[PDB]
Structure 1
Amino acid sequence: GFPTELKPGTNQFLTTDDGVSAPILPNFHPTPCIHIPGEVRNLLELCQVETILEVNNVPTNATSLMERLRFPVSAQAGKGELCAVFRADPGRSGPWQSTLLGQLCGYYTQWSGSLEVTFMFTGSFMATGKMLIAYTPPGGPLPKDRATAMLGTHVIWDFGLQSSVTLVIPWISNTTGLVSIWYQTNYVVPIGAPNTAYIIALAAAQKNFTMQLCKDASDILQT
């Protein structure tokens, strides 16, 4: 007869309690845990993965839909003009929504951490030229010209020498930063090289990336 008085909150059903409840079949031994490759224990292990960053945004209509993963880079019109720019926040909708990162962050709310942006050039072995990638922190808007962009944190990127350049986004937490890509140089096309080449952009999170709050997003499902 151990005396107890029922503290309020009895009989309640909570959808989040980490309680252990009675088992249907106590005498049941499941199929033993065998070893299978590619076990994941945390979602961060996905955020460290190079994924494609949809920068180009044109669904006209679906045949050209695959042109969303690529940049246009040609001789024309020429030097100095802006090539492409994009947002710097995965949660936002959403050129980042291509990444697994963007989608995963869509199942969360609060972010924190550094980001890697890896660009790959896909032109001929012969074509050269250099381009300027500049990072712009939250405060302050898109710098109007390269001269102003150079002053900020930036990366002078060549083709002819290296084809893969990684840009490190230093930090993000809660305008939300900007990244601008510039024609520093002309687009050289020897003789038979195509005047226009395309670029693929890869993005991923740093090892110090964290999310904090579970939340569920938008999908549809009919009969």
Structure 2
Amino acid sequence: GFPTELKPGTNQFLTTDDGVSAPILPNFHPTPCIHIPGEVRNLLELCQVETILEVNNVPTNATSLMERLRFPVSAQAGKGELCAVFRADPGRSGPWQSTLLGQLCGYYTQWSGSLEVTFMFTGSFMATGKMLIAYTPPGGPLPKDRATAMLGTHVIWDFGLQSSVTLVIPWISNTTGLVSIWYQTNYVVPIGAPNTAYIIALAAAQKNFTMQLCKDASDIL
């Protein structure tokens, strides 16, 4: 007869309780671990994967399926407006729902990290011109004029250098800044050259992405 105290909460079922039980058959040996030269242990491998983001979600026809992946640009438009990226928020709707991180955030609430964008130029061999991509810092509203854009951080994009240009946003959380893309100058070509081109964009995140709070939310269905 050993005395023992009965703590409250005996028949409660706990979802987060990690339990272990003795195997029924202690004699069967599981299959040996397979040795492979390359070894990967952590989920960090997914954080460096590149994903394409698209804006022209207007068409829905069957025979227009392949053109979705890019956005065309033409010389007919003059000093207009190329693309209007929505507020950068993986949780909210928009281009970010297709990405891996946005799906991962579907069970989660608070996120923070850095953002980088890469651009490469695919024009004609004889063309000359200058492109500029700038991100407006927080506080500043949407750029009405290019003067309000220049006060923010801007990077020069020459046509002799293709993709070594790197832009970094120091910190994004959850309110924030906005990014806009205008026509820096019109792409002009002489006779015997195509009148249309295409532009490819890249987007990734740095190592400083972290998670704090789990959420019991499921987006499916």
Tell me the TM-score range normalised by the shorter chain: 0.7 to 0.9
- Mapped to 2, the partners of 1:36 and 1:193 lie a distance apart of 53
**Distance in 2 (alpha carbons) for counterparts of 1:64 and 1:36:** 45
Asked if the contact 1:54/1:96 (under 8 Å) is kept, the reply is: no
Q: Comparing 210-219 with 72-81, which one deviates more in the overlay?
A: 210-219
**What number of residue pairs does the alignment pair up?**
221
On the 8 A contact 1:139/1:177 being kept in 2, the answer is yes
Determine which structure has more spread, i.e. the larger CA radius of gyration: 2
Specify whether residues 53 and 81 from structure 1 end up closer, same or farther in structure 2 by C-alpha distance, changes over 3 A only. closer
8 Å Cα contact 2:138-2:176 kept in structure 1: yes
Instruction: Specify which structure has the higher proportion of strand.
Output: 1
Q: CA RMSD in A?
A: 2.9
Long gaps (5+) in structure 2 = none
Q: 1:67: which partner in 2? A: 67
Question: Using the alignment, how far apart are the partners of 1:17 and 1:156 within structure 2?
Answer: 55
Q: Indicate conservation of the 8 Å contact 1:69/1:201, yes or no.
A: no
SS at match of 1:180: coil
Q: TM-score, normalised by structure 1?
A: 0.81
TM-score (norm 2): 0.82
Distance 1:9 1:172, change over 3 A: same
Could you report, residue by residue, the CA deviation over 1:114-163 in whole angstroms, capped at 9, with x for unpaired residues?
Answer: 11222333444444432222212343321112221111122232335425
Structure 1: distance between partners of 2:137 and 2:80: 22
Shift of 1:102: 2.2
**Structure 2: distance between partners of 1:24 and 1:186:** 75
- C-alpha contact (below 8 Å) 2:72/2:196 kept by paired residues: yes
Alpha-carbon spacing, 1:195–1:175, altered in 2? closer, same or farther (3 Å): farther
2:12, 2:158 → 1: CA distance? Answer: 64
2:177 matched residue in structure 1: 177
Instruction: Give the superposition deviation at 1:187.
Output: 0.7
CA gap 1:86/1:190 in 2 versus in 1, 3 angstroms: farther
Q: Which runs of 5 or more structure 1 residues have no equivalent in the other structure?
A: none
Distance 1:38 1:70 in 2: 36
